[PDB]
Amino acid sequence: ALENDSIAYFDGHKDSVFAIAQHPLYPNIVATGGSEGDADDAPGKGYVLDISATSLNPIFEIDGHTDSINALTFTLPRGDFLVSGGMDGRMRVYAVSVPQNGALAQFKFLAESQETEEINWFAPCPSPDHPNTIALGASDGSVWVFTLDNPVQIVQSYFLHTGPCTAGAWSPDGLLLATVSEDESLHVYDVFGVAASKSLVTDNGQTVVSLTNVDQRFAVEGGLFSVAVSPTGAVVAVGGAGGQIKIVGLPRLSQAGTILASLQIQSDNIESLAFSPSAPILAAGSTDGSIAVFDTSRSFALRRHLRGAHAEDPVVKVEFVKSPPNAAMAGWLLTSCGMDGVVRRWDLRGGTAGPGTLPHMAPSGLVKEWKGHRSGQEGGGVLGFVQGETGERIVTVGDDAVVLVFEAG
């Protein structure tokens, strides 16, 4: 008799659902992908759902993965493609057509490739200058940038990390790509060569910032697991073992590699980092169950330490609502999910603020929670979510092989 706040669900996955992606123009279109079983020959499987529809029927199926789907993304700016990335290293590219008569979206397979042996993440490039460009990071530490137009061309392939590449994030202008590794390194790639023409690259010609375990003010023993770039592109934050966060300077493209701040409020891996798009704050989710919030214009002074945000289960993902219905809350509303099987939303306006960081206004500031997934101890936990522009509909993917739809309103 678990509480269940879902307004819809999808139970077509046979095992853990690792990945979710939302169409950038049509938030009702969502793709989910994961594992079909734990037997070592179990294949991967993906679905596309239309959430405008209690038990959802998919409008498309992603087949061809011989191992778990680890990553999914629609391309920016308009979702012309859908890409899936597997534990098998397979990258499958689909053309996406969304008829203007309101009929079902169509998906056509274009090509499969296998540049790496295992894909850890995708990130679409936000540059308006380079549409339909995507980056991925792999288990061999390599980072690949592709452009889709054989629709696939290679923009770059990087081999600087020596251990698994755990996360990547683009700068807002989409000219820089920051990636981190278990081997404790951070590299920020000059993907389209702009920084090099301005004489802003390191001696390896490829990055604007390269920091490794030999850099003593930087090295995070145990590795890095998360990365985020500030809305101005001025700094990158990296999160790692033992609750450590490092703030590093980026060059202005329109100084670099300096450690501007080191943070260690939390006690275990920083798995998720997010800069607020419009408030001077940085949120960090930890494996220890807490979320911490820092004031970016006050040397990252601590604003609030939300202990037990997800009890003592890992905080898996934090993400700011881009355009909440209450415009006064823009930049201050945070959504999080955890291995406790719960999704939560937080009002971050409170805490210890200071000059320039006041709003024009179990832990505090909880606005709402959504239950339905099993908890981690019962084979559940929320592995990811999307929430569109307004945060009014939340779609989750769970370790318990379920996809749930929640509503905020």
Author numbering: 52 to 104, 127 to 222, 228 to 332, 366 to 472, 487 to 534
Paper text:
In the case of Sqt1, we were able to decipher the mode of L10-N peptide binding by X-ray crystallography. Moreover, the binding mode of the N-terminal residues of Rpl10 (L10-N) by the eight-bladed WD-repeat β-propeller of Sqt1, as revealed by X-ray crystallography, allows establishing a refined model for the final pre-60S maturation events that lead to the stable incorporation of Rpl10 and the release of Nmd3. Taken together, we propose that Sqt1 may protect Rpl10 from aggregation before and/or promote its incorporation into almost mature pre-60S subunits in the cytoplasm. We conclude that the β-propeller domains of Sqt1 and Rrb1, which harbour the essential function of these proteins, recognize the very N-terminal residues of Rpl10 and Rpl3.
To this end, we also performed in vitro binding assays with the orthologous proteins from the thermophilic, filamentous ascomycete Chaetomium thermophilum (ct), whose proteins often exhibit improved biochemical properties. Both ctSqt1 and ctSqt1.52C (deletion of amino acids 2–51), which fully complement the absence of Sqt1 in vivo, could be efficiently co-purified with ctRpl10 or its N-terminal 20 residues. As a first step towards the elucidation of the recognition mode of the N-terminal residues of Rpl10 by the predicted β-propeller domain of Sqt1 at the atomic level, we independently determined the crystal structure of ctSqt1 at 1.94 Å by molecular replacement and of ctSqt1.52C, lacking the dispensable N-terminal extension, at 1.5 Å resolution by single-anomalous dispersion (SAD) followed by molecular replacement using the ctSqt1.52C Se-Met structure as the search model. While the N-terminal extension could not be resolved, the crystal structures revealed that residues 52–533 of ctSqt1 form a typical eight-bladed WD-repeat β-propeller; thus, being composed of eight blades that each contain four β-strands and showing the characteristic ‘velcro' closure owing to the presence of the N-terminal β-strand as the outermost β-strand of the eighth blade. Analysis of the electrostatic properties revealed that both β-propeller structures notably contain a negatively charged top surface, whereas the bottom sides exhibit a charge-mixed surface.
